[PDB]
């Protein structure tokens, strides 16, 4: 017993929070193409089987209160749990509509002493957002258990760096994501799809600008795992 | 390709940096028994095949001088790079003797921009250090230069690391034997994966105090590699 039991009734509820306009006390631009990314990504998980509920433009209020009521669902008939957070944000932080949230204060509803239902089962967040400013010129060659286990954090960047988003087909991480879920769901283990992802992200995109301070950028985004199984999709 | 290419004239170097003794301005307490540790990790690595070079009681100074060195040597003939830390530490910092050093002043090094002999190549960072005081209660039941780097952490982020003076720490101890046990067999991934597990379900700790009794641990894997990491073939 190496892997997670991925055989419960249902795969379980996989949350996307879309934020795409900000309040203008915010001064934040609003984040163009991110519907492309809400689309994809329900199509993939429902694809996976997973039970998807879409929301969009959240407030920081929003996001916790949707967080608390879906910590005291009952995941026991749940293999899993999914959350997928689309907006800006900084090294530790989401912005929900009107500021920000701290992904800390998101993730704990989910700790294995507050949501029992969830307790040795696979805890995933996909965070498509900023954590700092930073950008990537690249270069060439072209029992018990702990409270903090079973989380798996894949961040689109790395910690410090921005995140690109492409105004046509969404931002590079989630379409590289998807295209990979698609691809290997069904054979891979989900660490060495993420993997894969990282591979696609990092060889496959470079910025554009007419602005050579923001012109070809690489990126590599960041794969945090607690998860203490191997993780298949299929059974 | 999807696996990194581990078959380079050499492995690579495998810089242990221990620090037991720390100076007196700093207030800090000896490491008990981390020798334990990085002995350990020296037949571990020595069997993968590693160039293992010790060093023991580094000063901040000390710490990021040798990483400079070591970023600027030849890496042609090497197939990848390992640095394991054993010293107090905070969230994104690890300590000298004297005092503090950014971990990313030190991984900065070897980002593929600044040692291109490595470029391409996996980067593995194993660190053995506290990255906050919290503790577990546990519950019942063209690249990008910051890619191809993976941090095995001790601990999530905030959290204390507990280490036994004499068996050796949770997770050094784990990763040895998950190493020692599996290197030959899975990917880099499922073995830190074997060690979360490990760690996380075999150790708990004991104090006559309530405040330190019945602990948990849980190690952390941060990955920016772009392919699958074999110590074979």
């Not at 293999?79 to 907006?87: G, M």
């Not at 949230?101 to 965070?127: A, E, H, M, Y």
Request: hydrophobic share 35%.
């Amino acid at each position: 017993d190496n892997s997670y039991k991925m055989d419960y009734p249902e795969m379980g509820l996989c949350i996307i929070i879309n934020n795409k306009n900000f309040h203008k006390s915010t001064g934040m631009t609003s984040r163009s193409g991110t519907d492309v990314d809400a689309a994809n990504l329900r199509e993939t998980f429902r694809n996976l089987k997973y039970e998807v509920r879409n929301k969009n433009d959240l407030t920081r209020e929003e996001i916790v209160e949707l967080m608390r009521d879906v910590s005291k669902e009952d995941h026991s008939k749940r293999s899993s749990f999914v959350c997928v957070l689309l907006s800006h944000g900084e090294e530790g932080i989401i912005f929900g509509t009107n500021g920000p949230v701290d992904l800390k204060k998101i993730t704990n509803f989910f700790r294995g002493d507050r949501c029992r239902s969830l307790t040795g089962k696979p805890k995933l967040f996909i965070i498509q957002a900023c954590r700092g400013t930073e950008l990537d010129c690249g270069i060439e060659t072209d029992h018990k258990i702990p409270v903090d286990a079973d989380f798996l954090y894949a961040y689109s960047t790395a910690p410090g760096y921005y995140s690109w988003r492409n105004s046509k087909d969404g931002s590079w991480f989630i379409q590289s994501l998807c295209a990979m879920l698609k691809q290997y769901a069904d054979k891979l283990e989900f660490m060495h799809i993420l993997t894969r992802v990282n591979r696609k992200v990092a060889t496959e995109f470079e910025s554009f600008s007419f602005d050579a301070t923001f012109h070809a950028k690489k990126q590599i985004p960041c794969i945090v795992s607690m998860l203490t199984k191997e993780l298949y999709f299929y059974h």
